[PDB]
Amino acid sequence: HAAKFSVEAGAGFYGGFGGQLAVVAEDLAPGLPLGVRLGVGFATSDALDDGYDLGGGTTWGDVKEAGKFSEWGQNVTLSLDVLYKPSGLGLPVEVAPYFGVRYNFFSGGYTDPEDNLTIKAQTISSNQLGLGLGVRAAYPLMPNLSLVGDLGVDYYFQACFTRVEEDDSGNKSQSSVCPGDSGYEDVNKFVTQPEWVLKLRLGAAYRF
Ligand SMILES: CCCCCCCCOCCOCCOCCOCCO
Ligand SMILES: CCCCCCCCOCCOCCOCCOCCO
Ligand SMILES: [Ca+2]
Numbered sequence: 001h002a003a004k005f006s007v008e009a010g011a012g013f014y015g016g017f018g019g020q021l022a023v024v025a026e027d028l029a030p031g032l033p034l035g036v037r038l039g040v041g042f043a044t045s046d047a048l049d050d051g052y053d054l055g056g057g058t059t060w061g062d063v064k065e066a067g068k069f070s071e072w073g074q075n076v077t078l079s080l081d082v083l084y085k086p087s088g089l090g091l092p093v094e095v096a097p098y099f100g101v102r103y104n105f106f107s108g109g110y111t112d113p114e115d116n117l118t119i120k121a122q123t124i125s126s127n128q129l130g131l132g133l134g135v136r137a138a139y140p141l142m143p144n145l146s147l148v149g150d151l152g153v154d155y156y157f158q159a160c161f162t163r164v165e166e167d168d169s170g171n172k173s174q175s176s177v178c179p180g181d182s183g184y185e186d187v188n189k190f191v192t193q194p195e196w197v198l199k200l201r202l203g204a205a206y207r208f
Contacts, residue, residue, distance in 0.1 A: 001030065002027060003025065003027060003028060004025070004026050004027045004207060005023065005024070005025050005207070005208060006023070006024045006026075006205040006206055006207045006208065007021070007022070007023055007024075007205065007206055007208075008020075008021070008022045008023070008024055008037070008039070008148055008203060008204070008205040008206075009021055009022075009203050009204060009205075010022075010148065010150060010201035010202060010203025010204075011201060011202060011203060012150075012199075012200050012201035012202055012203075013043075013198065013199065013200040013201070014041055014043040014075065014077065014197060014198075014199050014200075014201070015043060015045050015075060015194060015197045015198070016043040016044035016045040016046070016073070016074075016075065017043060017044055018041060018042045018043025018044060018075070019041065019042060019043075019201075019203075020039050020040060020041040020042075020077075020201065020203070021039060021040055022037050022038060022039030022040070022079075023037070023038050023039075024036070024037045024083075024205065025037075026083070026085070033084060033085035033086070033087060034082065034083070034084060034085075035081075035082070035083030035084070035085060035096055035098075036080070036081070036082060036083070037079075037080070037081040037083060037098070037100075037136075038078075038079070038080055039078075039079045039081070040076070040077065040078055040079075041075070041076065041077040041079070042074065042075070042076055042077075043074065043075050043077075044073065044074060045073035045074055045075050045106065045108060045192065045194075046071070046073050046108070046192045047071055047072065047073035047107075047108025047109055047110075047124065047191065047192055048060050048071065048108075048109075048110075048190055048191060048192060049189070049190055049191075049192055050064065052189065052190045060190065064110070066116075067112070067115070067116045067117050068113065068114065068115060068116075069110040069111065069112055069113075069117070070110055070111045070113055071108065071109070071110045072108050072109070072110070072111070073106075073107070073108025073109075073192065074106070074107055074108060075104055075105065075106050075194060076104065076105040077102055077103070077104045077105075077130075078102065078103045078104075079100055079101070079102045079103075079132075080100050080101050080102075081098040081099065081100035081134075081136075082098060082099060082100060083096040083097070083098040083136060084096060084097055084098070092139070093137050093138065093139050094137065094138040094139070095135055095136070095137050096135065096136045096137075096138070097134075097135055098133070098134055098135070098136055098152070099131075099132070099133050099134075100131070100132055101129075101130070101131060101132075102129070102130035102131065102132055102154050102156070103127070103128070103129060103130070104126075104127065104128045104130055104156060104194055105125075105127055106125065106126045106127070106128065106193040106194060107123060107124065107125045107126075108123070108124065108192075109121065109122045109123035109124050110122055118167060118168060119168045120165060120166050120167050120168060121165070121166045122163065122164070122165050122166075123163070123164045123165075124161055124162065124163050124164075124191055125161065125162040125163075125164075126159050126160065126161050126162070126191075126193045127159055128156040128157055128158070128159045128193070128194060129156070129157055129159070130154045130155060130156040130157070130194070130197075131154065131155055132152055132153060132154030132155065132197075132199075133152055133153055133154075134150060134151055134152020134153065134199060135150070135151055135152070136148065136149070136150050137149035137150070138205065141204075144206055144207040144208065145204060145205070145206055145207070146204065146205050146207075147202075147204060148201075148202070148203045148204060148205050149201070149202060150199065150200070150201040150202075150203070151199065151200050151201075152198075152199040153196065153197065153198055153199065154194070154196075154197045154199060155195070155196055155197075156193075156194040156195055156196075156197070158179050158188060158193075158195075159179075160176050160177065160178040160179075161176060161177050161178075161184075161187055161188075161191060161193075162174065162175070162176045163175050163176065
């Protein structure tokens with residue numbers, strides 16, 4: 001007893017703009033200031049480094065313009081955080097240090113809305129295990145509602161990549177490189193999947 005469950009929404013930066021939804025459980029015990037948060041994040045992300053040279057001095061940013069290709073990227077991030085809340089702060093704001101584990105689903109690539117380049121779509125993917133650290137600030141606003149601030153940093157371990165090309169006839173090709181297969185180093189320099197991620201969000205938590 002008693003056990004305080006809230007749902008928390010936040011918006012802001014996670015390697016790109018996006019948001020998160022989470023459930024928090026706190027006051028898990030009479031004595032304890034332990035807290036647990038499970039959360040999911042969606043954010044935009046950049047998929048290929050514009051400054052990477054494929055030539056020649058010619059960069060992916062350069063050929064992107066030439067062929068009018070559309071780049072897109074995203075991260076979906078499942079996270080678990082253990083939070084601790086210091087007693088006799090003594091501040092008007094609650095600050096909880098937290099550490100946790102993450103699982104990220106990265107994906108992006110480009111489409112060929114035309115002209116040139118047969119015509120099609122190319123997509124790359126990586127699922128990574130991450131670790132991270134941060135602080136969560138909460139301020140009581142109204143009944144059952146607090147303002148929440150969150151700053152943290154996550155690190156992700158390099159994982160395999162999976163490429164899918166699709167032609168106009170609809171034919172599909174698939175492949176994957178691992179650490180450490182042949183062209184992995186190169187793929188990894190070019191593909192903008194997570195490594196270090198700054199997390200900076202504002203949001204609100206509703207109790208019950
Ligand atoms: C302030 C901590 C940063 C310290 C690390 C040095 C430079 C960090 O860049 C490393 C590359 O990390 C790539 C993550 O990019 C942001 C996430 O969004 C794109 C990935 O999907
Ligand atoms: C939060 C503390 C964790 C300590 C991090 C130490 C890192 C040592 O192992 C690094 C292994 O990860 C390989 C890096 O992956 C390549 C990233 O480049 C991505 C761009 O495509
Ligand atoms: Ca880019």
